[PDB]
Amino acid sequence: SSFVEKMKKTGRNIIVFYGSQTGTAEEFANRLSKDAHRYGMRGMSADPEEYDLADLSSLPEIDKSLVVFAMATYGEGDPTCNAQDFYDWLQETDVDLTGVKFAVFGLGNKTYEHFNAMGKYVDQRLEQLGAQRIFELGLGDDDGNLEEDFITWREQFWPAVAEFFGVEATGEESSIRQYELVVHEDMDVAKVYTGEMGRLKSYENQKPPFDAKNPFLAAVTANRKLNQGTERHLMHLELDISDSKIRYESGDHVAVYPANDSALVNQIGEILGADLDVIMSLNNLDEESNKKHPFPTPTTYRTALTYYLDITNPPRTNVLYELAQYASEPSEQEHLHKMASSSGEGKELYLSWVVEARRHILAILQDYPSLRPPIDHLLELLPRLQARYYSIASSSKVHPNSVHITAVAVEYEAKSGRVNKGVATSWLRAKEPARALVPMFVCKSQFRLPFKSTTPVIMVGPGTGIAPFMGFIQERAWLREQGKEVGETLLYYGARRSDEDYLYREELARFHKDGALTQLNVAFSREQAHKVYVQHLLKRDREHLWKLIHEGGAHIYVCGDARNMAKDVQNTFYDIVAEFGPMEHTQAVDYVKKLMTKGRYSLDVWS
Ligand SMILES: Cc1cc2nc3c(=O)[nH]c(=O)nc-3n(C[C@H](O)[C@H](O)[C@H](O)COP(=O)(O)OP(=O)(O)OC[C@H]3O[C@@H](n4cnc5c(N)ncnc54)[C@H](O)[C@@H]3O)c2cc1C
Ligand SMILES: NC(=O)c1ccc[n+]([C@@H]2O[C@H](COP(=O)([O-])OP(=O)(O)OC[C@H]3O[C@@H](n4cnc5c(N)ncnc54)[C@H](OP(=O)(O)O)[C@@H]3O)[C@@H](O)[C@H]2O)c1
Numbered sequence: 001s002s003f004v005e006k007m008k009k010t011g012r013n014i015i016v017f018y019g020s021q022t023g024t025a026e027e028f029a030n031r032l033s034k035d036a037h038r039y040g041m042r043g044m045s046a047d048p049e050e051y052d053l054a055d056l057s058s059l060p061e062i063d064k065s066l067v068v069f070a071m072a073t074y075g076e077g078d079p080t081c082n083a084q085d086f087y088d089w090l091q092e093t094d095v096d097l098t099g100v101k102f103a104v105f106g107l108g109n110k111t112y113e114h115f116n117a118m119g120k121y122v123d124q125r126l127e128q129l130g131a132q133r134i135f136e137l138g139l140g141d142d143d144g145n146l147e148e149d150f151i152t153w154r155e156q157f158w159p160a161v162a163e164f165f166g167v168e169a170t171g172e173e174s175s176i177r178q179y180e181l182v183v184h185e186d187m188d189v190a191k192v193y194t195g196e197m198g199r200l201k202s203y204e205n206q207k208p209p210f211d212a213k214n215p216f217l218a219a220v221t222a223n224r225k226l227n228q229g230t231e232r233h234l235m236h237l238e239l240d241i242s243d244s245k246i247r248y249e250s251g252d253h254v255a256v257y258p259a260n261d262s263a264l265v266n267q268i269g270e271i272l273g274a275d276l277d278v279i280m281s282l283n284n285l286d287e288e289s290n291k292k293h294p295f296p297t298p299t300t301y302r303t304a305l306t307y308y309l310d311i312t313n314p315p316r317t318n319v320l321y322e323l324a325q326y327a328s329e330p331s332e333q334e335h336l337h338k339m340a341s342s343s344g345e346g347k348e349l350y351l352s353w354v355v356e357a358r359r360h361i362l363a364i365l366q367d368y369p370s371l372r373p374p375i376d377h378l379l380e381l382l383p384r385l386q387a388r389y390y391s392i393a394s395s396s397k398v399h400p401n402s403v404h405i406t407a408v409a410v411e412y413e414a415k416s417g418r419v420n421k422g423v424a425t426s427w428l429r430a431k432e433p434a435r436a437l438v439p440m441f442v443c444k445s446q447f448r449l450p451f452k453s454t455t456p457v458i459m460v461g462p463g464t465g466i467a468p469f470m471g472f473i474q475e476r477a478w479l480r481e482q483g484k485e486v487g488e489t490l491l492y493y494g495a496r497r498s499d500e501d502y503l504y505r506e507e508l509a510r511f512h513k514d515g516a517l518t519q520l521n522v523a524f525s526r527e528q529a530h531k532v533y534v535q536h537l538l539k540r541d542r543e544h545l546w547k548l549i550h551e552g553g554a555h556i557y558v559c560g561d562a563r564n565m566a567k568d569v570q571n572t573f574y575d576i577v578a579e580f581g582p583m584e585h586t587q588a589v590d591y592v593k594k595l596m597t598k599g600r601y602s603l604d605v606w607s
C-alpha cells in the first residue's frame, strides 16, 4: 500500500502522480510514465489519493528514483479533488525529504486569477522539505495551447533527467499501438466487467468505504422538474446514501459516473461495422508497462463505449493524426492531417471546425466516409469518461442520508450542424424513482459555513448556482430550531423570468417567513427591457452589506462562473468598500482580497 514498495515490486524507478479532475493531467502523467522506457528506465503513473505521500520519505531507498507531479489547478487555486489529501498533508508536515528528486508540471489557465497555484505550491513546498529539484517547474496554459506547452517542456525534461541518472535515449523504434486486441470465445459472465470503475463486481457488492475508485450506487428517490417554463429543463434530484457510511456537509460536491446515450453508442458501432457485443480485452504490447489495460477488461465494446470512454467531446489533434492513416480517400486524409498540424492555419481549421463547432467522434466518422478504422484501435485512442461534479444542495444536519442535486439539462445545437446532449445530465434526467441507481462519491470542499453560528452570511448564487445555498439555509434554519443563535442570512439569487425558471420559490418563501432567510433578494434578467443581476441588488444594499462586512464580520459566498459573474460581483464589492471605507479603489481591492485570504470570501467556481 506504499507506492514506494509498489515501485520496488515492479522495478519502477520513476513515479508520476496526477492531480487531475477531467483527465488532462492524468493523460500527461500516463505519457510521461511511458517515456521512461525510451531511456532504459521504468515508471508508472498513479493517483496520489490511493496512496500516502508521506511515503516520499522512503523513495531514497530505490537507486536513481524520481517522483514527477502533473497537477491541475481549480477554483481559487485549490487542488483537484484527488489531490486534497496530499495537499492537506503538504501543509501539515515537516518531514525531511533530503535524497528525494522531483519535477513538477502544472496545468493551469492564465485567464483565472490564481494561475497554476497548485503546481507552484508543490514545486515550492517540496523544495522547503529538503527534496532536490532536477528540472524546472513547467507552467502549462490551457488559454493558449496546453498540449504544446507540455511537449516543449517534456522535450527538455527527458534530456536533463537522462543526463542526471547516467542513461540515454535507447533509440527504440516505437510501436504506434500501445495495446493489442484479444477476443474471448467463452468468458464467464461474472468474469466480464459490465461498467464498474474498479474491483470487479464492486458495483453489485457494495462494500464501504466508498470513494472515487469504489463509488456507491445510490438510488434516486426523487427527480422533478423545477422550472415552470419549457425553454430549458431544470431538475432536482435526491439520492439515498443510507447505509453507505458516507458523510457530507453543506458546500461539498457529489460526483457521479454517467452512461453515454445508448443511441450514440449504437451508431458508432454501426458506422464501424462492429459487433458491440463481442466480449474482449486490450493488452499492453509492452509487457513491462504498469498500465496493463486502457480500462477494465475483459468487457464488451458496448460497455467500454458506454461507461469507460469519452465519445462526446471534441477529438484531440492526436486522435485525428492517428485516424488519418485510415482514410481511403487522399483529400480526406490530407484534411485530417491539416487539422492535426502545427501550422498556424492548420491549428485554426481545428479550433474552428472541430473544437468550436463541437464535433465528436461520430460526427467525424460521418464527415469522413473513407475513414474506416478498426474499432479496437479506436477504443485505445479515446479518453476515459470522467465523473461530473455537482454542488450538494442539502444539509447533512437535516438530510444525513440524502444528497440533493440541482442541475440544468444540457442540450444545444452545435455549429457542427447536429444536436449535442450532455452526458451526465441526460443520464440523470432519465432516472425515474420507479431502482434507478447513480454511482457516486463525495468530495469535500472548503466552501463551509462559518465556524461560529453567529457570523452573518452573504450568499450570491445566480441560476442553478443557488444549489449549495439551499444547503446553507436548511442548515441555518435547523441551527435556529436548535435554540442556537444565528447571524443574518442573506441570499442574492437571479433568474431569467419569474414565470420561467425561478427556482425553489416555495421552499424559499417558507425559509423567509420562518426567519431562517433574513432577506431574499431576487433579480430577473429578462423580465423587462432592463437586465438585472445580483450585483445590482448588492449595490442597492450597499449600506447594510458594508455594515455586516466591516462590523458584523460577515462571510461572503459566490457560486458559479469565476471569470465573469464572480468577477463582476468581486468588482461590485470593491466599489462598495471604496465608497464606505472610504478608500481608493486600490485599497478597496486589498481589503476584499484580504477577506479571501482571511477566509471570509469563498468562491465555488463551476467554470
Ligand atoms: C466544482 C463544480 C461544481 C459544479 N456544480 C454544478 C451544479 O450544482 N449544477 C449543475 O447543473 N452543474 C454543475 N457543474 C457543471 C457540472 O459538473 C456539469 O459539467 C454540467 O452539468 C454538464 O455536464 P454534462 O455531462 O451533462 O455535459 P457534458 O456532456 O459534459 O458537456 C458540457 C460541455 O458542453 C459545452 N456546452 C454546453 N452548452 C453549450 C452551448 N450552448 N454551446 C456550445 N457548447 C456548449 C461546454 O464546452 C461544456 O463544458 C459543476 C462543475 C464543477 C467543476
Ligand atoms: N459566464 C457567466 O457569467 C455565466 C452566467 C450564467 C450562466 N452561464 C453558463 O450557462 C449555462 C446555464 O447556467 P444557469 O442555468 O445556471 O444560468 P442562467 O439560467 O443563465 O442564470 C444565471 C443568471 O445570471 C445572469 N448573468 C449572466 N451573466 C452574468 C454576470 N456576468 N454576472 C451576474 N449575472 C449574470 C443571467 O442572465 P442572462 O442569461 O439573461 O444574461 C441569469 O439571470 C451554464 O452551464 C453556465 O456555464 C455563464
Ligand SMILES: Cc1cc2nc3c(=O)[nH]c(=O)nc-3n(C[C@H](O)[C@H](O)[C@H](O)COP(=O)(O)O)c2cc1C
Pocket: 019, 020, 021, 022, 023, 024, 025, 026, 072, 073, 074, 075, 076, 077, 078, 080, 107, 108, 109, 110, 112, 113, 114, 115, 116, 117, 142, 146, 605, 606, 607
Ligand atoms: C472550474 C474550473 C476552474 C479552474 N480554475 C483554475 C485556476 O484557478 N487556475 C488555473 O491556473 N487554472 C484553472 N483551471 C484550468 C485547469 O487547471 C486546466 O483546464 C487543466 O488543464 C485541467 O486539467 P484536468 O483535466 O487534469 O483536471 C480551471 C478549470 C475549470 C474547469
